[PDB]
Homo-oligomer: A and B are copies of this chain.
C-alpha cells in the first residue's frame, strides 16, 4: 500500500551554503561564514571566539577560514550562539570535537542545543542537528572575557526562548566600535497567539524589540546578514547599507504586527 514518508533533509537556499573568504568587520572581528549565514571570528591575544557556526555541514569551511586567519583548532577557545537552531548552531558539536572550544549559552539555548533542536516549540522534530553540551551557563547581562575582550549577553527571547544578542567593543581606524550581534526577530510559520507551547510569546517578542532598540550599537550584525541589510558579497561596501539596531527593531516590530493581524484574520 502506502509507506510512511521518507525523512526530509533540511534543505536551504544555495547562498546559505556558499563559502566566502574571511571579511574583516573591525580590527579583531571577521565574518568567516557563508555568503548568507553569519559566523563571526573574534581574534584576541589569548585565543579566538566564534559567534555562531551556521549549518551543520560548515564545520570544515570554518576551520579553513580560521586557519587562513592564523587560528589553529587549539586556538579556538569559546563558541557563543545567537540561537540554537540548525542553521546557526548546526556544526557546534563537530567544532567542539575538532577544537579546543567550549560553549557558553543561557539555559534555554543549552537545553535546545543538548537535544539537537528536536522537540522544537514550533517545528517539533522537523529540523534537527547534532546535539552538543554547554560548558558554561550565562545569565542575562552577564559578561565573558577572552584576551581582555569583554562580551555581554542580552537576552531577547522570541524567535527561540533562549535567543541572545551579544555585544562587545572592538576598534577600527583608532576608534572604539561597539558591535552588536543581534539574533533573529522573525517568527517563520509560528502560531503567535494562544500558543500552548509558548503562552507568553507575544509579550517576549515585544520586550525583545525594546532590548534590541537599546543595545550599544555602532555596528549591527545579524545571523542572516540580509536582516540588517548586510551584503557579505559586496566586498568593500558589504556593510554600507547596514541598519541601526533601532531601525532593525522597528522593522521587525512592524513585520510582527503585520503577521499578528494576518493571524487574527486567518
* A side interface size, CB within 8 A: 63
B135 near A96: Cβ-Cβ < 8 Å: yes
29 contacts between A and B (CB under 8 A): A1-B19, A3-B14, A3-B19, A4-B17, A4-B34, A6-B17, A8-B9, A9-B9, A46-B74, A47-B74, A93-B115, A93-B118, A94-B125, A96-B135, A97-B119, A100-B100, A100-B102, A107-B162, A110-B111, A111-B137, A116-B128, A128-B128, A131-B131, A133-B133, A139-B197, A140-B199, A140-B200, A142-B196, A142-B197
Interface string of A183-217 (1 = CB under 8 A from B): 00000000000001111100000000000000000
Q: A111-B111, A116-B116 are in contact. Are A6 and B5 (CB under 8 A)?
A: no
How many angstroms from the CA of A6 to the CA of B87 in the assembled complex?
Answer: 12
- Which residues on the B side are within 8 Å of A4 (C-beta)? 17-19, 34, 55, 57-58, 61
A198 to B137, alpha carbons, bound, how many Å?
11
A130 contact from B8, B17, B97, B115, Cβ within 8 A: B115
Instruction: Enumerate chain A interface residues (CB-CB to B < 8 A).
Output: 1, 3-12, 14-15, 17-19, 34, 46-47, 55-58, 61, 74, 77, 93-94, 96-97, 100, 102, 107-108, 110-111, 114-116, 118-119, 121, 125, 128-131, 133, 135-137, 139-143, 161-162, 196-200
A7–B7 CB distance below 8 A: no
Contact A11 B6 (CB under 8 A): yes
Residues of B within 8 A of A10 (CB): 7
Instruction: Please name the 3 residue pairs, one residue from A and one from B, whose CB atoms are nearest each other, closest first.
Output: A141-B199, A9-B9, A118-B130
A116→B130 contact, CB < 8 A: yes
